[PDB]
Design a binder for this molecule. Sequence first.
Ligand code: BCL
Ligand code: BCL
Ligand code: BCL
Ligand code: BCL
Ligand code: BCL
Ligand code: BCL
Ligand SMILES: CC[C@H]1c2cc3[nH]c4c(c3C)C(=O)[C@H](C(=O)OC)c4c3nc(cc4[nH]c(cc(n2)[C@@H]1C)c(C(C)=O)c4C)[C@@H](C)[C@@H]3CCC(=O)OC/C=C(\C)CCC[C@H](C)CCC[C@H](C)CCCC(C)C
Ligand SMILES: CCCCCCCCCCCCO[C@@H]1O[C@H](CO)[C@@H](O[C@H]2O[C@H](CO)[C@@H](O)[C@H](O)[C@H]2O)[C@H](O)[C@H]1O
Ligand SMILES: CCCCCCCCCCCCO[C@@H]1O[C@H](CO)[C@@H](O[C@H]2O[C@H](CO)[C@@H](O)[C@H](O)[C@H]2O)[C@H](O)[C@H]1O
Ligand SMILES: [Ca+2]
Ligand SMILES: [Ca+2]
Lengths: 259, 277, 41, 40, 63, 43, 43, 42, 43, 43, 44, 43, 49, 49, 44, 43, 41, 38, 39, 42
Amino acid sequence: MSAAITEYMDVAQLTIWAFWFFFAGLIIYLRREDKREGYPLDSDRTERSGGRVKVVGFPDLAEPKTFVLPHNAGTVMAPRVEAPTSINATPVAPFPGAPFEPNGDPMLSGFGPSASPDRAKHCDLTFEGLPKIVPLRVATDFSIAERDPDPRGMTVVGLDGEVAGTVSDVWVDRSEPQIRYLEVKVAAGGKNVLLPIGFSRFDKKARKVKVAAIKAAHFANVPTLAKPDQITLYEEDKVCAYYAGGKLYATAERAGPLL
Amino acid sequence: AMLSFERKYRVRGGTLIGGDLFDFWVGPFYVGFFGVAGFFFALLGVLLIVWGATIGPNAELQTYNIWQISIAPPDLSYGLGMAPMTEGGLWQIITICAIGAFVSWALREVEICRKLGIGFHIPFAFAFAIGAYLVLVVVRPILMGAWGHGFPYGILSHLDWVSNVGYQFLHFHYNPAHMLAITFFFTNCLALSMHGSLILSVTNPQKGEEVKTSEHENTFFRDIVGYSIGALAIHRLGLFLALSAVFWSAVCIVISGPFWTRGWPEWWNWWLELPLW
Amino acid sequence: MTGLTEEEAKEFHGIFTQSMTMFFGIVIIAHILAWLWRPWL
Amino acid sequence: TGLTEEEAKEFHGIFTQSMTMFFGIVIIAHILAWLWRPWL
Amino acid sequence: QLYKIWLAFDPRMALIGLGAFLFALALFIHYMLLRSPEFDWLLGPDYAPVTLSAGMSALPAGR
Amino acid sequence: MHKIWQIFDPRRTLVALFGFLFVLGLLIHFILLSSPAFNWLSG
Amino acid sequence: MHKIWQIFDPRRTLVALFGFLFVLGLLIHFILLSSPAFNWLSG
Amino acid sequence: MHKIWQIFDPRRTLVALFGFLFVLGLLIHFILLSSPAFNWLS
Amino acid sequence: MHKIWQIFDPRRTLVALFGFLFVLGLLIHFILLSSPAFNWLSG
Amino acid sequence: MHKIWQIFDPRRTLVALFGFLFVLGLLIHFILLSSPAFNWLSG
Amino acid sequence: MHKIWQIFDPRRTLVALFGFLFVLGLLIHFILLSSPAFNWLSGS
Amino acid sequence: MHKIWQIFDPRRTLVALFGFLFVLGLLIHFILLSSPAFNWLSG
Amino acid sequence: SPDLWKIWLLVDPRRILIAVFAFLTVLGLAIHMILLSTAEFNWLEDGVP
Amino acid sequence: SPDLWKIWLLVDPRRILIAVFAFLTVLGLAIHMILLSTAEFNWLEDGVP
Amino acid sequence: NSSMTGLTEQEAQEFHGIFVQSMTAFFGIVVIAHILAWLWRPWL
Amino acid sequence: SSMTGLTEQEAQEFHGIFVQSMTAFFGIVVIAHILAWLWRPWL
Amino acid sequence: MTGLTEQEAQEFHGIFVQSMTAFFGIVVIAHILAWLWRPWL
Amino acid sequence: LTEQEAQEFHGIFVQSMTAFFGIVVIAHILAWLWRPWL
Amino acid sequence: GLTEQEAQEFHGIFVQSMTAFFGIVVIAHILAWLWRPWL
Amino acid sequence: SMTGLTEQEAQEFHGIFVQSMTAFFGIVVIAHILAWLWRPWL
Ligand code: BCL
Ligand code: BCL
Ligand code: BCL
Ligand code: BCL
Ligand code: BCL
Ligand code: BCL
Ligand SMILES: CC[C@H]1c2cc3[nH]c4c(c3C)C(=O)[C@H](C(=O)OC)c4c3nc(cc4[nH]c(cc(n2)[C@@H]1C)c(C(C)=O)c4C)[C@@H](C)[C@@H]3CCC(=O)OC/C=C(\C)CCC[C@H](C)CCC[C@H](C)CCCC(C)C
Ligand SMILES: CCCCCCCCCCCCO[C@@H]1O[C@H](CO)[C@@H](O[C@H]2O[C@H](CO)[C@@H](O)[C@H](O)[C@H]2O)[C@H](O)[C@H]1O
Ligand SMILES: CCCCCCCCCCCCO[C@@H]1O[C@H](CO)[C@@H](O[C@H]2O[C@H](CO)[C@@H](O)[C@H](O)[C@H]2O)[C@H](O)[C@H]1O
Ligand SMILES: [Ca+2]
Ligand SMILES: [Ca+2]
């Protein structure tokens, strides 16, 4: 054997071409894996064709893979058929690609940044089968680190600076110990609502929790929990999505543009 | 066409500039003001590169070979002024278009982030890559005093630029910021393989097993290296490693020539000449 | 199944062949012209 | 699994004949290539 | 009645913003003078460039 | 052949066709300019 | 031709057309500026 | 042509037009500066 | 022109205005410094 | 031996085996081409 | 000895074995092709 | 002008001002040492 | 085969036509580019006429 | 073999049709590339005729 | 049932007629350009 | 409806203004090319 | 429709052409002075 | 922003624009005396 | 997941295909040996 | 009022702002006067 395959072809040239064929197959494989969610696409192409043309692009979809959930929570198929969901919005113009304007109060529309899918109405579970996100009042073995302030008792302040409530309890993740939610006693109504840690900016000196997402008045409409001591995956999405809607809807100037 | 869950997210507003003028989608892409600006910045820059390839360095050497196409910066004698189009001026125009396209891409990402109500980590992270490019073609050439210090626009020709810039300091491996940046690049790749492996091995376990848990994830690397950073923190670490690699790479090149002209191994003479030894 | 009726398959196949041979005929003429211009064998 | 038995037989009929047509054209091309420039 | 800037910009951000900008601008201009050999005061008041004789050249031939 | 528009969406076809033709026109002009035998701006 | 605006929406189409025309206009000027025989700024 | 403002919003168009005009003016000045016969700072 | 301040926010417009003027002022100073015939920091 | 297919899937074995044989055939052909004593594409 | 495959899965053990045997066979063939004394494709 | 301490924290600004001056004093000394016209440790 | 029409019950004609048109266009571009890349068949640089 | 037709009971015939056509196109392209790379069988740069 | 594009029979015929008329005009201009190009500089 | 949300009347009305704007643009272009040809013929 | 009710658009258009023609006149003066400085054709 | 705050801002904004413009013109006059460019 | 009866049929065809594939291979190696022996 | 400030502190903040401005610009003026005498740049 030798390095020269022909007068021009050599082993290194063959090796690099061999990689291109493998890499092409790898990209096709990866794109097919990418398409296990959200495909076939929601398209006008399908709509005018009466559903006779499924928009998948290239490569086409893969055969459904099986996710067996722990604790007999069920089995999900990664490529799955999903029922169409109506949107609480209307197009701002009739051309394709035009955005939609939410209907009613945008913070309550469940559209745009306030939209969320309906997840399972079951709590995420620890390896031992207990609910994962729970208040500190039921996860008695958990505690706040000594060097960090206790969130409980802190004043919750909305985006406008007005006081929204106080922190009654802290919800922790029992698998990876960390704060995920802050239970707020709303100043107006008194009904407890959850506040995700991702929307909470701590002011350690002032003992204040600043929520730039929504105003103090918006806290009254935060989606509530069925059971007081646990939260389902469905409820988690509903709560987080509501605060996210405030990043665009809470104040009129947040819609933009800047100039 | 949108994803089957995407329609409920295609909301009006959230633009930085333009309001409703360009607030629409073209196929999957969001356009906005900076989609229009970015696209025609890129389109012009791409066409000028093709035009730069059409005339080549000269008519004899002109080539459409994708490896050999090269739009070169001006000669150093042009300083920080503008050069004639066929003598590096085209490179200067393409560089301006590239900056316009890259920044518009970042700003379009900001508008998308506002629409979706997510953190601005992605455009912030992309700014580091843009900053590295700006260091290479703007900050460093200005510090050196000539636009000709920028790298040529060519798939292989800019490797010759990297090679020769490195050998302008006789052994570029000894650049301390370069060593730090490579360490971050190598660690990031290791962390990425680890994170990709752990997620895949947990959600695609052995046959006959259910999907594993976050407890398995922490246990696995505790069992291997005695520590688990956590599901959230690995993404902090991956972002930190990638951004630190680019930051230190930008530092390493901007000190190579503007703030250090000697061979890089000689820089370590401060340590060798410590009076302790 | 591709969502097409069985009569559509007959009808598509006929038009597909007509367009294919028409394309092939132009190609064959092009190669005859190209061969007369500059033979390669 | 999917395709039944009768259409499996029928598919082979067009598959075998079309492949044979491709093979025959290949043989003709290789006969022409050997006359043009033999390699052995 | 020029207070209105303080009703639309926080005193604290502007004062820190002004200080950072002014310090950066002063550093920048000081560096630009050092960039120019005519205004490079770090060379000394009685700075004299080395005299070149007998066909000396400070730099090698260029292009 | 008017039935091609019952299988192919005319809007997407026209977008693809107009885009390909514009790129093709640029490509052919660029090729000619790259050949000194056909660069019409050389004098 | 006026049905085309029932196929291509004026708002998105006009934005694409004007930018493509402007970029095309810029490219041709740049091509001429790069051609010594037609560089009107050569003096 | 007054109807173009029923397609494109005027207050948004003015900002886009200002940027386009400024960016075009910048480019032309730079192209002139790249030409020695028309570089006015030589 | 006077009620433009209801269309355009005076706080954000000024911030954009001064930023534009600063960048434009920096660019022209940079262009003059780059020009050897107008560099006032040389001899 | 006929009872092998209880564990090994007939379908995935064929594609795996055909793919293996194909790249094996390429490798052997390419090794011979790299050998001047067995390259059939030279003079 | 008849008590070997009650623990090792027939499918897994053959898959691991077949891959290993091919690699060993490939390696040995390549070593011999690399040794001028046993290269059978060199011409002599 | 005593009201500047109602705006800025006396503790943080004193650490910052002591930190900033110390670094400024370091760099100027190092710059002078690096300047032959002002290095005082050479003879 | 007189039953070759049955291919359009198995393969999607819309996707097949897109694939063949894309393949043919790329192949036509590739052959032209290869021909222009040779001294012998570059009809623009051959100097004829 | 009187039962070769049973290959189409286990694997989808549509996938084979595209896979065989894609594989043959690649194989045909590769062999042409190999021959062009040879001085002996390059029909574009041999001077014949 | 709607076709694969939603266009009716008359719509497809209506689009096809304008498409071929636009195609014919484009190709006719192309032919004129190539004739002028051939007179300017024959390439074959 | 239509692919763009434009009726027969609205599309025809847009097309009219589009065509006159297109014609005026083409007219200036034609004069520009006539002047350019007089300045420096290229063919 | 952007909400401009064919009279606001007409009213804005009048100011738009007026400012545009003022800008174009200023541009025309500059190009005349530029031509008097250094003709380019 | 009410129309009363628009009257106040416009007067100050125009006054500041005119002052900046006048200082700019003075600078360009001095620069022309220092080094004419046309 | 494949029963015994369809296993009996598969092995027969697979052996026939392997024997058919082997036979072509043997002829090619014979022809190659005549063309240029390697051992 | 968006800064959480009243009509009193803004008035006195401005007066100190210009008072610091005037001194800082006065030092700048003297610095440039001395620099021009030492080495004029024009
Ligand atoms: C080239 C000729 C001369 C020379 C020519 C000039 C000229 C001309 C000038 C100076 C000026 C200065 N020169 Mg000098 N200068 C020279 C050499 C030197 C050397 C040296 C060792 O070589 C040094 C250390 C200096 C130092 C200085 C400074 C004292 C001064 C810059 C003020 C400033 O930065 O405010 C900016 C920084 C501030 C902090 C401003 C504070 C105001 C704000 C409102 C405070 C906000 C506080 C808030 C908390 C924000 C804090 C900052 C952030 C937290 C980051 N010069 C050479 C020798 N120099 C300038 C001057 O006199 O300014 C008064 C000036 O005009
Ligand atoms: C090197 C010496 C000769 C040469 C020697 C040979 C030899 C020997 C062979 C070829 C073959 C081919 N050559 Mg040659 N060939 C040369 C130069 C060229 C040039 C060129 C521009 O220089 C081109 C474009 C080609 C192109 C071709 C293809 C037509 C064909 C392989 C296509 C394929 O992979 O089918 C695979 C892909 C498919 C989709 C096949 C489909 C099979 C169907 C079912 C059968 C009927 C076809 C049906 C109508 C579908 C149309 C597809 C057609 C193949 C177009 N040759 C030089 C001049 N060439 C091969 C051939 O004849 O194959 C037909 C072949 O054996
Ligand atoms: C030796 C070099 C020769 C040359 C020799 C050849 C030879 C030989 C051939 C060509 C072919 C082509 N040449 Mg040539 N050609 C030369 C120089 C050129 C130059 C140039 C600037 O110099 C250009 C632009 C071209 C361009 C072309 C294309 C028109 C064509 C390839 C089309 C294609 O890939 O379709 C592929 C993509 C599609 C078909 C998708 C389009 C779908 C269409 C719309 C289907 C419509 C259906 C319709 C009713 C029926 C089919 C009819 C046909 C499509 C017309 N040639 C030089 C002078 N050329 C080929 C050809 O004639 O093909 C027709 C061909 O065989
Ligand atoms: C080298 C010799 C000649 C030359 C030889 C040729 C030859 C030969 C041809 C051209 C053609 C063209 N030349 Mg020329 N050309 C030369 C120099 C130039 C220069 C220059 C600055 O030097 C320019 C700008 C051009 C520009 C052009 C274009 C107008 C045209 C390609 C259009 C296209 O690709 O559409 C494709 C893009 C699209 C279709 C997208 C547009 C989408 C729009 C919205 C829809 C339009 C479709 C419409 C309904 C129907 C189209 C036809 C209509 C009746 C107008 N040429 C040199 C001097 N040129 C071609 C032509 O005439 O085409 C008509 C052509 O065949
Ligand atoms: C080449 C000949 C001359 C020269 C020729 C000219 C000419 C001609 C001009 C100048 C002008 C200027 N020159 Mg000069 N100039 C020279 C050398 C210098 C040197 C130097 C050290 O060499 C310096 C520092 C300067 C500096 C200056 C500036 C004072 C001035 C530009 C101001 C500006 O752009 O504002 C723009 C920036 C702002 C208005 C705002 C800045 C604030 C920050 C940066 C913006 C952030 C946004 C902010 C937060 C907004 C908040 C809202 C408000 C609070 C309401 N020149 C040489 C020597 N120079 C111009 C002038 O006179 O303008 C007054 C001018 O026309
Ligand atoms: C070096 C000297 C000779 C040469 C010496 C040899 C020798 C020795 C051999 C080959 C073999 C092959 N050669 Mg050779 N060969 C040469 C040059 C070439 C050139 C070239 C362009 O130069 C090409 C394209 C080939 C091509 C080929 C292939 C046809 C074949 C390898 C196929 C394979 O890898 O199977 C891998 C892929 C598969 C196995 C997929 C399965 C495909 C088949 C159709 C399976 C069907 C099963 C059965 C038949 C079904 C029907 C049963 C009945 C219905 C009952 N040779 C030179 C000129 N060649 C080998 C061979 O003959 O194999 C057939 C072989 O042993
Ligand atoms: C900072 C950490 C790393 C990083 C991060 C990062 N990159 C990013 C992002 C982030 C967070 C994005 O959000 C953004 C994105 O959307 O990615 C999909 C992006 C992106 N990073 C990209 C590329 C990229 N990133 C690189 C590096 C990195 N990106 C870092 C290692 C590199 C390297 C190392 O070479 C490349 C090539 C793009 C895929 C995308 C930004 C796309 C974009 O800006 O689109 C607009 C522009 C065009 C479509 C074309 C513009 C063409 C020009 C007008 C002309 C050409 C100019 C150019 C200088 C030519 C040079 C060519 C030669 C060098 C060969
Ligand atoms: C997927 C990609 C597949 C690519 C093909 C893989 C098979 C090819 C394997 C090539 C292995 C190269 O192995 C080695 O090559 C070198 C370089 O020619 C040979 O080197 C020999 O040939 C060269 C070239 O005539 C001469 O200088 C001299 O006779 C000797 O050095 C060695 O004798 C050989 O052992
Ligand atoms: C380039 C990336 C984006 C950055 C944007 C800024 C680009 C450059 C800014 C424009 C500055 C132009 O400044 C102008 O440059 C040219 C070219 O050097 C100078 O020209 C001067 O040097 C050049 C070469 O050094 C000589 O050929 C010429 O004789 C001399 O006059 C002009 O004296 C100057 O007026
Ligand atoms: Ca010719
Ligand atoms: Ca030949």
